[PDB]
Amino acid sequence: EEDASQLIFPKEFETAETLLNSEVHMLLEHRKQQNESAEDEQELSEVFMKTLNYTARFSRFKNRETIASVRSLLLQKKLHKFELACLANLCPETAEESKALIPSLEGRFEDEELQQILDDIQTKRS
């Protein structure tokens, strides 16, 4: 029954806080910077390294202010939290591609209304 396409999740996960690829990337980078210092400490595990090299290959923007602006210009809408991560991470070109990938956008908003948002997201990319 758990299918994110139809906007359904358990009760505990419904009250979660979404994270973007750049956000998690900078969080892990800062954690690494803090951990590497303060000698006599247990070093990072393979999980941290794989997650780092996995999120580093999808960092659409390095500036934190870019993350702040792209979340601010998005939260003003009426979309759910789930629509804040996938759409901000994939960065599709045209509204048709976004509507095809995410079935929730089908009929939820107009075409130009989503195309303008996608163009803004593309421009915000570094």
Partner: protein
Amino acid sequence: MFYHISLEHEILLHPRYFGPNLLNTVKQKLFTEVEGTCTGKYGFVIAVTTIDNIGAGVIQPGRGFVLYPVKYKAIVFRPFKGEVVDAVVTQVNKVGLFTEIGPMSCFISRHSIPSEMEFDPNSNPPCYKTMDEDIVIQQDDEIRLKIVGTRVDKNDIFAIGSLMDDYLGLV
């Protein structure tokens, strides 16, 4: 998908650890206990960002161990069905494709792949191309996919991908 939620956990601390570094020792124990593990309720946990507070240690009767119900603010990665992410292809085989969704590895079969993407066993690097040889997909390429299934192999998540929906390849 990565998320930031508030979790709780308790750890018994042996009395030998009492002293001026009690809180530091509790934090150190917390770090090396709930990092990298996985559970079927909240999913795979990456790491811990910060700790909310340290509960009141209730010393057990007749035992020196004391438990601290700490509530930590850590991140978690619990992919669901239907989500679409961008991963990287790790290996190409005739049986199927292998990718790496961060701390998880999925797998797509030839049946999911359209008939246009044929095999290239003659060439040294296993790759799939079309008749015109315009589009090329190989390893170390940011290729998207769709999570159509989930699985947890005793705290080891292993989902399954798919390649039927359009607009799934090179961006």
